[PDB]
Amino acid sequence: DIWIAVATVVPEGNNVYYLRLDDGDKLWPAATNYPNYQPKPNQRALVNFTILADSHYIKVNAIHNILTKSIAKNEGAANDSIYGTDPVSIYNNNMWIGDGYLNIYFETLWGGKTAHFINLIQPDAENDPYTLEFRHNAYDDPQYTIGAGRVAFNLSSLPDTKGETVDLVVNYWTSEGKQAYKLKYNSDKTKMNITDMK
């Protein structure tokens, strides 16, 4: 009855929007508890919804935006300093590709004092375009408790894979060092020099 899922908000006019799920299904709000919600292009959200009739009609019970960003500019030697080296925790299955985004659920230590900067960068987009780094800067935030966070990164700036699938390597830093997660990525959502030859 009640479903909870990450969705992409797709605007249409004024405050009208539909929701696109990772498996590509579209959901059209027939009712809502948040009628003053402002849909934005290219924004993901955690949505609590009830199916009304089965593309489907729904009631939006709640909708909580997930921080949604594009891949940030490489800053070279200044990456550690700008983007941070503050460790996080990501379990297997808490990172996934859905609707052309890289989606992450991660944990870290928070203190309530300073906003953390969350990014995805390509250390070498020319030679290694499908190798990314998930970066976290806590700055001077005390480490008082464990807290969870969600983010989505728009992957549409990665080179076109044509309609083939490639390996996407995402590196991140933990308390026991650098780790990697390997996902399959195809620029064609449907099917879900360096690129001209293999």
CSV table of C-alpha atoms in Angstrom, one decimal, residues 2 8 10 24 27-29 31 47 49 63-64 78 87 111 136 143 149:
chain,number,residue,atom,x,y,z
A,2,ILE,CA,2.6,2.5,1.2
A,8,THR,CA,13.2,12.0,-10.1
A,10,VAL,CA,9.9,16.0,-13.6
A,24,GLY,CA,11.6,3.9,-15.4
A,27,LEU,CA,3.9,8.1,-11.4
A,28,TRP,CA,1.4,10.9,-11.7
A,29,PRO,CA,0.2,12.6,-8.5
A,31,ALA,CA,-3.5,13.8,-4.8
A,47,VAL,CA,8.9,9.9,-1.8
A,49,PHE,CA,3.4,7.4,-1.9
A,63,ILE,CA,8.4,14.1,-0.4
A,64,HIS,CA,11.8,14.9,0.9
A,78,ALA,CA,43.8,21.3,-4.6
A,87,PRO,CA,36.1,9.5,5.8
A,111,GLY,CA,28.5,17.8,15.1
A,136,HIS,CA,33.3,14.5,1.7
A,143,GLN,CA,32.3,14.5,15.5
A,149,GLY,CA,22.9,11.3,4.4
